[PDB]
């Protein structure tokens with residue numbers, strides 16, 4: 001469960017992401033597809049080449065949903081209800097993959113936000129992404 | 142979340158287990174230690190030989206906790222609170238391990254309950270053990 | 283795939299008693315009932331809305347037989363799982379887009395089905411050998427993913 | 429270790445720039461803060477109640493250097509990681525009783541640490557080669573568990 005300090009750490013870190021949310025989301029996706037190729041199975045309709053516009057656009061969408069989660073940290077299951085339904089009943093992504101995207105997002109943040117990525121903040125972001133993941137797979141079966 | 146049918150399924154199945162729980166708990170553990178040897182790292186102080194008393198004694202305790210969970214199926218997080226605390230703060234068992242024991246319990250039940258281990262019941266039991274595992278692992282950080 | 287001679291014998295002994303057609307159907311059907319997420323790959327199979335619809339679906343039954351038939355053939359080549367499944371690996375990745383995690387789920391469900399059919403005879407040591415076999419088959423089927 | 433020549437080269441070049449003392453300390457420290465369950469093995473190191481405590485703990489810093497030192501030596505043996513880490517695998521299983529899952533956690537933390545230090549230079553292709561190396565190391569450390 002996220003503690004007050006976690007929520008504080010996440011709001012601050014994400015704040016510094018700011019207008020770079022979109023770029024980071026795209027980078028994290030690219031990192032995932034290269035590092036963990038089995039994740040490409042969920043995107044057979046995507047042009048997966050470097051700098052592709054489908055990855056960019058999708059990177060933006062992920063990034064925005066996360067901004068929304070941060071803004072609704074105290075109430076995630078409600079702010080994310082439609083995305084939860086989408087992942088559970090339509091997309092049906094196996095849960096292991098969420099850990100893979102989460103890690104890649106951390107690596108992206110660690111690469112772009114050196115001063116801000118302290119050990120406590122790293123801890124907080126990891127729990128946060130984990131909660132987002134639990135929410136997104138909570139209606140699976 | 143367990144559905145009304147899931148609950149009925151689990152009560153029926155566990156009822157047939159009855160006064161065999163202990164014995165089935167021990168078998169699940171032996172199965173787990175043999176199929177997934179990394180799990181033994183958590184029991185370096187146990188005699189892990191076939192028929193071991195520590196193994197039997199521990200099977201009974203696991204089985205008793207599952208019976209208590211079945212008896213409080215509508216209030217599992219509270220019925221198992223103490224156990225959740227124990228696993229989180231003292232034992233600190235990695236969550237992947239819970240999936241391994243759950244699988245072995247299912248194998249154990251399948252081997253002893255041929256008429257009751259139907260597809261729908263298999264599904265309900267898997268979901269039930271997964272909920273029990275989430276509770277036991279919910280206070281980890 | 284480190285299998286000891288006595289594990290290999292154990293696996294082979296038991297498998298000789300298996301009706302692959304029947305066990306194939308049961309294993310595929312249970313996968314789709316217990317892990318409904320796996321139904322995303324079989325929308326052409328018609329009605330999968332309830333357990334009886336899945337378990338008795340003639341298409342699920344026919345596919346189960348095909349899957350387990352390939353699996354049996356793999357048991358005849360335990361020392362070269364990778365070569366044996368290379369073309370199926372590529373097919374599953376490039377044409378069917380199946381996340382290999384599903385191979386691990388099927389393997390475990392197959393183990394529950396074997397336990398269900400054989401009861402006592404599926405002793406802890408026999409199960410341990412089968413766990414190694416299903417992991418190897420899962421790894422061989424994933425090996426060509428890229 | 430199915431590492432590509434361009435991948436072996438990417439690993440080696442970046443590693444030549446690593447301050448092992450700092451990275452070791454930081455990776456082991458981060459493991460203990462991000463995944464507190466791992467503290468179970470390090471009760472005798474002292475106070476690990478807070479991040480500042482863990483990160484400043486001299487025994488954590490020293491143990492990090494040792495761990496990363498052995499990792500370093502493995503990077504010169506990439507064609508035989510299993511052989512290289514066999515004794516260490518035996519010791520992690522028989523004397524220390526460490527669940528090998530922790531090896532994968534340390535791996536990912538290490539990758540986050542490398543990205544944090546190298547920024548731009550830690551590109552997607554470079555990360556990918558490192559993910560293969562870290563899984564490779566984790567697998568070799570787990571190889572002798574029984």
Ligand code: HEM
Pocket residue numbers: 039042043058061062065066083086087091093097098099101132133136
């Ligand atoms: C924190 C984790 C994640 C979040 C916040 C997230 C969020 C989203 C969002 C916002 C969309 C777009 C929905 C729309 O168009 O309105 C989406 C779609 C999608 N996501 Fe997830 N996602 C996450 C993880 C994953 C993972 C791990 C996978 C599998 C590798 C995945 C696979 C997909 C796929 C295949 C689509 C449909 C893409 C398309 O057809 O355009 N997502 N997700």
Ligand code: HEM
Pocket residue numbers: 180183184202203206207224227228232234238239242243273274277
């Ligand atoms: C189905 C989930 C599980 C349940 C319901 C369960 C239940 C219990 C119970 C009742 C105890 C005894 C606590 C006491 O003495 O009051 C216990 C202890 C213990 N459990 Fe869990 N357990 C589960 C899974 C696991 C797994 C996956 C592991 C690690 C592989 C594990 C490792 C331990 C250990 C090492 C002890 C201490 C044993 C001793 O020192 O005597 N448990 N558990």
Ligand code: HEM
Pocket residue numbers: 320323324326348349350352353370373374378380384385388419423
């Ligand atoms: C033991 C592991 C498995 C083996 C040995 C196996 C084997 C096979 C074989 C022999 C075929 C027919 C290939 C062809 O049409 O040319 C096939 C097709 C297929 N497999 Fe696999 N399979 C396995 C697991 C799975 C899993 C777990 C899934 C998804 C949950 C899956 C999804 C599919 C799909 C969707 C097809 C094509 C169905 C169609 O004809 O429309 N397979 N598999």
Ligand code: HEM
Pocket residue numbers: 466469470491494495496498499516520524526530531534535565569
């Ligand atoms: C990259 C993976 C790892 C490597 C290469 C590594 C390497 C080493 C080495 C070289 C030693 C010194 C052994 C000796 O004195 O002969 C050691 C000790 C130890 N390692 Fe590992 N280690 C790794 C990961 C882990 C992790 C993840 C854990 C637990 C979270 C762990 C727990 C320990 C413990 C408890 C000791 C003994 C320390 C003491 O003297 O108190 N190791 N390790």
